[PDB]
Design an enzyme around this catalytic site. Structure first.
Site: not given
Ligand SMILES: CC(C)(C)c1ccc(C(=O)NNC(=O)Nc2cccc3ccccc23)cc1[N+](=O)[O-]
Length: 256
Positions: A14, A17, A33, A114
């Site tokens: 996705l 990584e 994840k 963020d």
């Protein structure tokens, strides 16, 4: 128990990584994840339970594996057309959902730090989910606010006080980045490289030269909201309770 129900096949990368994982038995889809800081991300993730924040299911060590809500609609990033943006009703709906998620996070004392279109994911119904808490931190605990001092985020989205002050309140910074996201959704461009005195595009904005891009692409109603969000002084900047009272925020635009 049912055999095999603990097995997940990694069937698609996705991002880097993060892998799309599908349950061997149930075929339930999740995001995994895989990280080779993580302790803190996992801890904050355990506090999170809201329909506009990516769900955290759990983790296991092997290399850490974070089991995350899968969002099949991808990134908001991909819904924004360069120089165009997107239809205003779509942008308003995404902004409503972004505010809902950010209100939730701030309510439990967490700031994301963020916010940007790459970190705003969409589920199969295009509901927005705030993603990736690797930079997130606590700004309120036991009902006491802590001021931030770490410089982080992404420059075009970051608030000016982060660039000029040693310490700053967390919430106005997230509000600012949401404003930059809204500008992006409506104009398909970012207004400046960074909100600094040396940045011409930012100076132009403070001088209210809104006959220039991106501002001239934006209708006066949403523009008026942006004039209240993208305010240099964080203490004067509009808060979310007042964003919820804004004319454009409340304007009927989009059919169900
Ligand atoms: C820098 C900003 C403004 C914020 C930005 C600009 C462009 C993109 C982008 O290119 N997103 N990717 C797409 O594929 N966008 C498109 C969506 C719908 C129709 C389109 C038609 C033709 C070409 C592209 C289109 C992403 C972002 N950003 O969020 O960082």
């Amino acid at each position: 128990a049912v055999p095999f129900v603990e097995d997940w096949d990694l069937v698609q990368t996705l991002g880097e990584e993060v892998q799309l994982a599908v349950n061997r038995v149930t075929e339930e889809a999740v995001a995994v994840k895989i990280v080779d800081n993580i302790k803190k991300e996992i801890c904050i993730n355990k506090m999170l339970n809201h329909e506009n924040v990516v769900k955290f299911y759990g983790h296991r060590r092997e290399i850490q594996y974070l089991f995350l809500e899968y969002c099949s609609g991808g990134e908001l990033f991909d819904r924004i057309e360069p120089d165009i943006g997107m239809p205003e009703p779509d942008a308003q709906r995404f902004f409503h959902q972004l505010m809902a998620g950010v209100v939730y996070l701030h309510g439990i004392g967490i700031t994301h730090r963020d916010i940007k279109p790459e970190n705003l994911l969409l589920d199969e119904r295009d509901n927005l989910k705030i993603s990736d808490f690797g930079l997130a931190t606590v700004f309120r605990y036991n009902n006491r606010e802590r001021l931030l001092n770490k410089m982080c985020g992404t420059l075009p989205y970051v608030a000016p006080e982060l660039l000029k002050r040693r310490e700053f309140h967390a919430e106005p910074v997230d509000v600012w980045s949401c404003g930059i996201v809204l500008t992006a959704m409506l104009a398909g461009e970012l207004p400046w490289d960074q909100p600094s005195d040396s940045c011409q595009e930012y100076s132009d904005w403070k001088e209210k030269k809104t006959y220039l891009n991106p501002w001239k692409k934006i209708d006066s109603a949403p523009l008026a909201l942006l004039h209240k969000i993208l305010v240099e002084n964080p203490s004067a900047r509009i808060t979310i309770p007042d964003i919820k009272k804004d004319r454009w925020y409340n304007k009927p635009l989009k059919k169900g």
